[PDB]
Amino acid sequence: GNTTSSVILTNYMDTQYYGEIGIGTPPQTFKVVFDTGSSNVWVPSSKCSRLYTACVYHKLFDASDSSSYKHNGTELTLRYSTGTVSGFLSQDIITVGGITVTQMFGEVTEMPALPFMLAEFDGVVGMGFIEQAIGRVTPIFDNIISQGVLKEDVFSFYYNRDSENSQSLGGQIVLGGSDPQHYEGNFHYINLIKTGVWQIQMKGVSVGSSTLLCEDGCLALVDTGASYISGSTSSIEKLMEALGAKKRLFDYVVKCNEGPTLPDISFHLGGKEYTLTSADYVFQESYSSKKLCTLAIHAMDIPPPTGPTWALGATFIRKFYTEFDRRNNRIGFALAR
Amino acid sequence: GNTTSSVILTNYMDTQYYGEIGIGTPPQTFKVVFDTGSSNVWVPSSKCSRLYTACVYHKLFDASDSSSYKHNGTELTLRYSTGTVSGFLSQDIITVGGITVTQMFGEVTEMPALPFMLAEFDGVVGMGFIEQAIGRVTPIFDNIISQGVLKEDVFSFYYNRDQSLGGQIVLGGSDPQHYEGNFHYINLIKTGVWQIQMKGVSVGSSTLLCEDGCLALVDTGASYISGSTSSIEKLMEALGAKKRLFDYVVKCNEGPTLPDISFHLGGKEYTLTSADYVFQESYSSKKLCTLAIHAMDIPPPTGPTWALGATFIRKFYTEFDRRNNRIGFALAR
Numbered sequence: 161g162n163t164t165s166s167v168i169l170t171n172y173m174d175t176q177y178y179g180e181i182g183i184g185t186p187p188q189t190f191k192v193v194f195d196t197g198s199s200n201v202w203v204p205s206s207k208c209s210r211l212y213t214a215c216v217y218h219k220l221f222d223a224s225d226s227s228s229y230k231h232n233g234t235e236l237t238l239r240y241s242t243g244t245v246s247g248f249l250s251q252d253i254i255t256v257g258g259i260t261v262t263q264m265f266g267e268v269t270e271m272p273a274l275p276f277m278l279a280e281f282d283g284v285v286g287m288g289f290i291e292q293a294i295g296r297v298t299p300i301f302d303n304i305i306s307q308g309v310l311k312e313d314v315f316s317f318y319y320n321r322d323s324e325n326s327q328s329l330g331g332q333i334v335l336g337g338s339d340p341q342h343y344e345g346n347f348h349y350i351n352l353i354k355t356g357v358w359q360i361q362m363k364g365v366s367v368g369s370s371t372l373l374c375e376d377g378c379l380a381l382v383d384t385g386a387s388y389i390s391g392s393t394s395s396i397e398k399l400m401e402a403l404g405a406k407k408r409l410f411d412y413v414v415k416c417n418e419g420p421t422l423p424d425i426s427f428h429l430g431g432k433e434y435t436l437t438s439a440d441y442v443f444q445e446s447y448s449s450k451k452l453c454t455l456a457i458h459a460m461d462i463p464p465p466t467g468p469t470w471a472l473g474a475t476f477i478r479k480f481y482t483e484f485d486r487r488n489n490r491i492g493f494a495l496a497r
Numbered sequence: 498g499n500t501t502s503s504v505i506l507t508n509y510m511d512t513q514y515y516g517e518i519g520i521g522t523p524p525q526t527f528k529v530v531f532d533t534g535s536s537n538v539w540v541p542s543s544k545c546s547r548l549y550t551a552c553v554y555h556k557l558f559d560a561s562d563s564s565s566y567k568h569n570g571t572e573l574t575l576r577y578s579t580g581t582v583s584g585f586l587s588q589d590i591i592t593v594g595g596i597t598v599t600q601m602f603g604e605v606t607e608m609p610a611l612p613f614m615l616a617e618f619d620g621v622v623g624m625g626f627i628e629q630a631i632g633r634v635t636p637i638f639d640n641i642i643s644q645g646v647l648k649e650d651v652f653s654f655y656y657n658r659d660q661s662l663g664g665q666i667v668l669g670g671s672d673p674q675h676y677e678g679n680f681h682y683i684n685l686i687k688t689g690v691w692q693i694q695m696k697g698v699s700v701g702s703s704t705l706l707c708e709d710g711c712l713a714l715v716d717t718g719a720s721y722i723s724g725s726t727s728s729i730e731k732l733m734e735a736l737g738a739k740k741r742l743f744d745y746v747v748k749c750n751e752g753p754t755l756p757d758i759s760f761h762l763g764g765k766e767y768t769l770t771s772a773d774y775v776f777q778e779s780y781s782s783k784k785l786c787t788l789a790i791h792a793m794d795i796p797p798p799t800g801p802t803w804a805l806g807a808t809f810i811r812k813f814y815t816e817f818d819r820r821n822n823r824i825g826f827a828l829a830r
């Protein structure tokens with residue numbers, strides 16, 4: 161086949177990026193995060209009790225309204241480190257761009273307020289591999305590949321910084337290729353450590369010209385579902401000490417005046433420096449010496465086998481257009497625009 | 498005189514405990530946390546923009562629906578752990594149990610989704626001292642003290658584990674239906690703060706922290722027990738717990754044989770077993786169970802300090818005594 165296919169994302173405040181998918185006949189539409197850190201598709205279910213406020217606020221899939229729905233009912237429990245969701249397996253046709261595919265997905269009936277009452281999206285489309293898929297359900301991109309409609313077995317992500325203009329594209333995922341409007345130059349390719357997770361070795365992370373963390377090597381998950389860049393508690397503590405940043409309940413902060421003069425942070429990837437400046441990684445709500453500004457970075461201890469490991473999320477992806485390549489088990493990075 | 502008065506609390510999932518107050522004529526009712534760690538009363542305002550999701554899902558105070566509302570309008574900003582809420586000052590009559598009082602409170606018009614889209618409660622009634630009150634507003638308990646109605650100038654807290662009563666605050670005394678034996682009374686460090694000296698935190702029989710002294714804020718608005726980041730890192734090591742983004746956990750099967758944790762307060766050991774501080778949702782080795790304890794760096798002047806929150810209070814019924822500037826603990830029942 162010869163399909164490239166694009167899906168427009170809305171950017172909520174530079175921490176959530178989601179697009180629309182349609183499930184069923186006729187399609188019930190859902191806002192979903194496309195998460196290379198996970199491999200299951202789920203949406204909240206019309207069987208989810210209104211005891212879960214997340215099921216009052218979000219859109220719900222009603223199977224009995226879909227003529228292509230096929231019952232399964234097997235339990236599914238997705239125990240993310242942030243919060244477990246539970247429900248049951250269902251099968252139906254899922255539209256993503258112009259691409260239609262019969263997919264097994266979770267109908268979610270338990271959805272905790274932390275974190276789901278903070279979510280502007282309803283559901284998740286896991287773009288990881290079957291090796292991370294709970295209950296061994298074939299992931300949506302695998303079923304898309306089997307169709308043999310795509311140009312290349314690749315998909316790609318553009319995340320934009322949030323802008324005022326109702327005309328601004330929040331972001332874009334391309335299935336089957338990448339979109340040259342959204343990056344400059346050529347891709348630098350980095351081989352996966354292994355098939356099964358979107359993860360690469362990293363040689364180092366430099367604060368200023370000094371490669372002070374990860375000096376003897378570490379892992380990086382390129383994780384389009386992570387809002388911030390994250391590293392292990394021990395790494396992040398050292399990084400933050402290096403910036404002079406203070407830990408609060410939910411973020412790290414610097415006085416907003418001090419932001420622009422913080423040193424660059426560079427991630428040494430496939431033998432190149434991926435550099436974020438303090439313009440890339442500090443939310444500068446202002447430049448007041450009396451105000452504190454959040455860094456788009458925190459500590460998240462990912463448990464083995466995936467961790468310990470950094471996650472290069474939206475903070476990183478905004479600068480670097482990211483191509484996830486299934487045929488060659490590699491990730492390409494180019495400079496976004 | 499002679500008034501005591503109780504407010505029944507709803508227990509939401511062992512982490513939020515909130516009762517009802519009525520503000521205005523007729524009374525508009527709010528779910529509120531009674532927080533000994535702060536000193537302002539506030540509720541969300543009808544003024545709050547529906548852009549704040551928290552103002553859609555929470556009860557809103559509409560000042561024009563009350564014949565007792567008196568305008569004021571001073572800007573108000575409250576800084577908590579979780580961040581800031583903004584609004585302005587209004588005055589009205591507030592009902593808390595059988596007691597009615599004229600109270601200046603905040604009508605909040607800015608309520609960030611993190612954290613307020615997590616709260617079952619609508620607002621907060623500060624039970625702390627005027628010293629800690631923002632914009633120098635007289636705290637509700639001082640207003641109630643001025644009325645000469647309370648039996649004794651004390652109030653007290655019972656928090657249940659999720660019997661049927663979620664909890665109870667008594668204004669003017671303590672309820673014997675909810676504690677057993679006698680109170681042990683401990684001086685406050687200073688007026689201005691519901692904070693006492695602590696002289697050690699032990700894990701089993703091993704004092705591990707606070708050997709030379711530290712502070713314990715007795716903090717009814719805290720869901721867990723909290724300590725400084727460094728003390729909690731050391732405590733969690735002793736317990737074999739692992740940090741995750743939002744919690745510390747042990748494997749659920751390891752829960753029951755964790756050692757006791759003890760707080761040395763007013764010369765006696767206040768001990769929590771692992772049944773008291775591990776949320777045992779399961780006992781499976783395949784599952785991770787959250788500890789009802791975390792880090793919170795509380796800033797000067799008040800901190801560094803521990804905060805004895807609901808995890809502690811479930812076991813120890815607590816009396817806050819303004820006449821004597823002390824706290825008493827009795828074993829809850």
Ligand SMILES: CNC[C@H](CC1CCCCC1)NC(=O)N1CCC[C@@H]([C@@](O)(CCCNC(C)=O)c2cccc(Cl)c2)C1
Pocket residue numbers: 175176177178193195196197198240242275276278279280284383384385386387388474742
């Ligand atoms: C596995 N791969 C990383 C995971 C993926 C996550 C997807 C939702 C289900 C839970 C798993 N992410 C992640 O562990 N973290 C930290 C916790 C908060 C997340 C997040 O901020 C991310 C939102 C979606 N991300 C983007 C860039 O659009 C969030 C915010 C508010 C509510 C909720 Cl439920 C989650 C970001």
Ligand SMILES: CNC[C@H](CC1CCCCC1)NC(=O)N1CCC[C@@H]([C@@](O)(CCCNC(C)=O)c2cccc(Cl)c2)C1
Pocket residue numbers: 173174175275278385386387388389390410411443454458460473579580611
């Ligand atoms: C551009 N605006 C910036 C402001 C700054 C913010 C800092 C903390 C308190 C004040 C507001 N807001 C922000 O950044 N927000 C919104 C709320 C949820 C955050 C976040 O989604 C972040 C996940 C980060 N970590 C990953 C990806 O590994 C989240 C979700 C669930 C729980 C928690 Cl504690 C935090 C993301």
Ligand SMILES: CNC[C@H](CC1CCCCC1)NC(=O)N1CCC[C@@H]([C@@](O)(CCCNC(C)=O)c2cccc(Cl)c2)C1
Pocket residue numbers: 512513514515530532533534535577578579612613615616617621716717718719720721793807
């Ligand atoms: C100053 N005194 C301690 C403060 C008090 C708090 C009062 C409400 C507004 C913010 C200040 N609490 C506190 O610093 N922490 C840690 C952060 C989360 C809190 C909390 O879990 C507390 C629940 C209230 N507590 C009980 C027992 O009912 C929570 C949960 C979900 C949403 C929100 Cl807004 C807050 C518990």
Ligand SMILES: CNC[C@H](CC1CCCCC1)NC(=O)N1CCC[C@@H]([C@@](O)(CCCNC(C)=O)c2cccc(Cl)c2)C1
Pocket residue numbers: 241242243274510511512579612613615718719720721722723743744776787791792793806
């Ligand atoms: C009995 N059920 C137990 C489960 C355990 C849950 C923990 C997260 C991952 C695993 C499951 N749920 C719980 O424990 N919850 C509910 C969510 C809000 C938490 C909490 O209220 C705790 C505050 C703690 N710190 C204090 C008080 O000083 C919280 C956490 C993050 C942000 C905000 Cl605003 C509020 C308290």
Ligand SMILES: *[C@@H]1O[C@H](CO)[C@@H](O[C@@H]2O[C@H](CO)[C@@H](O)[C@H](O)[C@H]2NC(C)=O)[C@H](O)[C@H]1NC(C)=O
Pocket residue numbers: 231232233234
């Ligand atoms: C739901 O999904 C499960 C997993 O695919 C299906 O179970 C398999 O189905 C066939 C029997 O028709 C067997 O060959 C496999 O052994 C089954 N696997 C397991 C793990 O039991 C199940 O049939 C599907 N459910 C429905 C209702 O169609």
Ligand SMILES: *[C@@H]1O[C@H](CO)[C@@H](O)[C@H](O)[C@H]1NC(C)=O
Pocket residue numbers: 568569570571
């Ligand atoms: C609000 O209350 C304060 C109390 O200090 C008072 O001085 C001020 O005049 C009040 N404002 C109005 C408009 O009444």
